Symmetry: C2
Subunit: 297 residues, 2 copies
Amino acid sequence: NYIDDRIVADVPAGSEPIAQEDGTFHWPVEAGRYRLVAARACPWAHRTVITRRLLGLENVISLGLTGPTHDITVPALVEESSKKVVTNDYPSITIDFNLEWKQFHREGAPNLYPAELREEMAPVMKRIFTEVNNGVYRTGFAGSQEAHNEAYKRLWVALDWLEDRLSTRRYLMGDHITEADIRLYPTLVRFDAVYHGHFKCGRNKITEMPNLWGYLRDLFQTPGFGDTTDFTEIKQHYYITHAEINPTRIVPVGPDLSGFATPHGREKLGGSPFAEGVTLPGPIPAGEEVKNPEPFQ
Amino acid sequence: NYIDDRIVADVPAGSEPIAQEDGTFHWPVEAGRYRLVAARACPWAHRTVITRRLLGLENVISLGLTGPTHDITVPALVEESSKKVVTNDYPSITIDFNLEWKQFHREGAPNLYPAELREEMAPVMKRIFTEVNNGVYRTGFAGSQEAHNEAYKRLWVALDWLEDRLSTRRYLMGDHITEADIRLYPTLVRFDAVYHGHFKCGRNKITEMPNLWGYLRDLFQTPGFGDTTDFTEIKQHYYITHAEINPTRIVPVGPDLSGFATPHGREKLGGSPFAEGVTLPGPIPAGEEVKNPEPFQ
């Protein structure tokens, strides 16, 4: 049930979905019609939640929290009145939040997907997707030793590439946060907590990779990122649910997460999370706050 | 089949075992009569192997390598001619190697259990045994979340105590290596490789505990320690054998172990592995070398 309709600016409010030549349908951007159905534990869903918060779409698209499915399919945009699933194509969801929903953004919202960077961004995001975002899952769910070995090697070639890329750039695409960072963060923020041990990805902890760790902290401490990250629900989901990997269903007490709140040192690379004049997200809506905050959240 | 006979200096060579008032028997120290039956993966056995090497007992007590049992019982001293198990009481094995086998030590061998330190050493070793040596097993084999939580807390109270103790002392009992270090090393050397993930003990890696990590490297780089440590057999045993914890039986490629060979910085605390005039072990006997050496071994 892969559904790749799109919600777009050039279909007008109130319209039925409009058939496209490619067999899909295009639905209209409008307030109060659609719900984002997400899960705290799921990294793919996490992208959509972060983007919704950063752009100030919280008051125009509602939020439902459920359980993960990729590890109805989540994340999804759902038409509230009919419960039809409009789309579960998570890459187009965040691109469309940025480009199609512009007139509903908070005034002063960041430009997370700027025209001049889109071309160079495409291969960077593809490499991150196959070798890192999916790379952890291929390592963790490997069905043989040989499959583990290869997946692990691929993951670490890519993490070493990222560590080097981020030695001279504050964020993946330079001075400011972009869509690329929103696609990388959900993997990195779950790494020491889950993927390191549960998925056997641990050559090193992210805490031992200086550029990635500085970058991870810098993002975590930015609105939209840490305040949508529930470490308890992340760890409970993986360690309890994946009984074929962890039959005892015990959740480790560790790692110590207190480092996420420490000074990151990334200001030495210049830049800033957002361009000058960008406004910050308003207070997180009642009911959408992290239910299991760490003492530093 | 707990067997706590002892091999002692005051029973003469060739004698039958001599009945003691407490129901045990005492056997005579002599060359060429007994075999140490050990396993590379097993930390309790590892103590006996390290001590045998440090003291130069390799040419008078033979070595058999087998599989672990505590996680015949191993380690054990076995009478070669009869195959009777003389003892499997691993704490008295290493104490007796030091005190009863003195006339068979290499000339210039270290004094690992000196009279003046024995009293202060006893509680330190007991605390390490219940909270750390066994502490990892109680954490890893916990049968409920609650049992995990408590065992983890105990382990880390003790590791934080050790980290602080070793901030002002080069080794556990001061300037030189003692029996206490030989009982702690086997747990620490298996920690990042196995206990951190497999036993869910990972609040932090040992690499992130500066005093413990300096100490671990200092010991690893000393004769008797690193040259009896087979990381492949350690990881294979735990990750493949403990199918109730790890049903896939996959062995992680990580962690990266290359740090074990790096400068440890512990010379700033003074002291030295051995007292002045102590001689170093001779070449490891043919067949007793680590079969799966890392590039730095």
